[PDB]
Amino acid sequence: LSITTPEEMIEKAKGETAYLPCKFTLSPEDQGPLDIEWLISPADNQKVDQVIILYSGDKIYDDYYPDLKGRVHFTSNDLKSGDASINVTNLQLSDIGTYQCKVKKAPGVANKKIHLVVLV
Amino acid sequence: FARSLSITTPEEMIEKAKGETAYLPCKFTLSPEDQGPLDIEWLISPADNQKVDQVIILYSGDKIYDDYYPDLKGRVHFTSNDLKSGDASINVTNLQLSDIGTYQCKVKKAPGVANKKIHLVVLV
Numbered sequence A: 001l002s003i004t005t006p007e008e009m010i011e012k013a014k015g016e017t018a019y020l021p022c023k024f025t026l027s028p029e030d031q032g033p034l035d036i037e038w039l040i041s042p043a044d045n046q047k048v049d050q051v052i053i054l055y056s057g058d059k060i061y062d063d064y065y066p067d068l069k070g071r072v073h074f075t076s077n078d079l080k081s082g083d084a085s086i087n088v089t090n091l092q093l094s095d096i097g098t099y100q101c102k103v104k105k106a107p108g109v110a111n112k113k114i115h116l117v118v119l120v
Numbered sequence B: 001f002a003r004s005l006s007i008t009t010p011e012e013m014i015e016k017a018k019g020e021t022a023y024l025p026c027k028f029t030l031s032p033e034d035q036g037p038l039d040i041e042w043l044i045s046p047a048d049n050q051k052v053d054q055v056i057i058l059y060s061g062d063k064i065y066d067d068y069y070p071d072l073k074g075r076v077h078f079t080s081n082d083l084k085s086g087d088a089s090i091n092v093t094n095l096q097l098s099d100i101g102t103y104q105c106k107v108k109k110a111p112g113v114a115n116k117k118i119h120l121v122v123l124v
Helices: none
Strands: A008-013 A018-020 A034-042 A050-056 A059-061 A072-074 A086-088 A097-105 A108-119 B011-017 B022-024 B038-046 B054-060 B063-065 B076-078 B090-092 B101-109 B112-123
Touching: A008 A018, A018 A108, A050 A072, B011 B022, B022 B112, B054 B076
Parallel strands: A008 A108, B011 B112
Antiparallel strands: A018 A086, A034 A050, A034 A097, A050 A059, A072 A086, A097 A108, B022 B090, B038 B054, B038 B101, B054 B063, B076 B090, B101 B112
């Protein structure tokens, strides 16, 4: 299982929307249920690997997770097509940090990091 | 029911001698909103290398993938015959010194997620 988006740094201004890409391709043995998660490790605290969004069992859980609640959502209307990307709206300085996309389609697994910086 | 998906004793150390079998416990309790498909994964971060978070076993879509993952292939398996009952424990047979490291049990039953860490020590 591969995430074809490279690790990169996204820099946007406060108040704008950040698109954090995560596109993936599957290998032949990846026959299990698709599961996608993003995690944040914020620059403003010592917390790491906090879940911000999850697709599992063909359902999306977004605002359920408190970090970035109301502001992080999947961008695609068809995640199964290979697009696990997210948008973070109304960017705040507290959103700065490392975001990790995790894609699983059993037994395959892949992960990729995107760095986000927000400018005043 | 717990308030949120929980694992009993989320951080501990297990010690066993070389050649023996280690039992790594991971017993979980669901909360009422945990209604998605059960998914369980274990990872290893070996003391003897820079690699971290390497998958060693997975239960997903009601199937177990164990030897599929190269780390500890042939030697790591789930111990229970009923994972859905709350038992995500694994065992590692014929322990080698190279097995020393941090093992993470991750349990998901969407939207709930919980993790446990076990430091495994193998004695000569």
